[PDB]
Amino acid sequence: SSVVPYLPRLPIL
Amino acid sequence: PLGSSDLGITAIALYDYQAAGDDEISFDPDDIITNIEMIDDGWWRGVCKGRYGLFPANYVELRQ
Amino acid sequence: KVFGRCELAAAMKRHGLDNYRGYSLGNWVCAAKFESNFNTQATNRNTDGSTDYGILQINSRWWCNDGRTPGSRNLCNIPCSALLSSDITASVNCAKKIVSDGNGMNAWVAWRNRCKGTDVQAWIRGCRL
């Protein structure tokens, strides 16, 4: 039905 | 810029998020985040319920 | 941000889209018109659990990572939120991968449906470029 997302990668540099 | 009267870029929270760093914000689903700064492609800054700081962009939906 | 037609044309030309893979600038402007109505923030969820992001409505199954699209690739190697920026750099760089991947601009369903085989030069008439 619905997916809670994986967190995006830590901010670049 | 960021100093304007309007609420700038806004989003609605799709999922709970618990701040996990001194510079982060929390929100509950359906909370509005305002004055969004896209500082990084994946994590953004904004203002939610009187609190300013960082949050994962993919936990919100831009209005509209 | 909602772009002006000519404003977007200038920015796309600045980013190398004019005649990219042989598609004249009007193709690209037209595709953004019927994908997103020129809105950098457009976000549309699909019944397969993927979502289309930004000015060219790039999809999360193959192209970018939104964290919530199962069995997905990330061939543009970027979070989908990168495609929601007010400047078009990330959407343009991703678009170049997509249009070069074998089906040209047919990757964009609104381009196929509304732009292909029309007088796409219309989309750049009157613009200083």
The residue segments making up the domain with residue C20 are 1-129
CB C108 within 8 A of CB C58: no
Go through chain A and tell me how many residues it has: 13
Pairing of strands B43-48, B51-56: antiparallel
Which residues does chain C have within 8 Å of residue B38's beta carbon, measured at their own beta carbons? 81, 84-86
Count of domains observed in chain C: 1
CB C58 within 8 A of CB C91: yes
What technique solved it? X-ray
Domain ranges of chain B: 1-64
Quick one: residue C8, left, alpha or beta (phi over 0 = left, psi -120 to 50 = alpha)? alpha
Rounded distance between C-alpha atoms, residue B24 and residue B44, angstroms: 10
* In this structure, CATH architecture of domain B1-64: Roll (2.30)
Residue C5, domain CATH: 1.10.530.10
Question: How many alpha carbons lie under 13 Å from residue B4 in its C-beta half-sphere?
Answer: 9
What pairs with residue B48 in β-bridges? Answer: B51
Determine the residue among B41, B45, B61 to mutate to test chain A binding: the one whose Cβ has the most chain A Cβ atoms within 10 Å: B41
- Name the helix (H) or strand (E) containing C98: helix C89-99
Please tell me which of the candidates C41, C86, C90 has its beta carbon nearest to residue B41. Answer: C90
Nearest CA in chain B to C2: B64
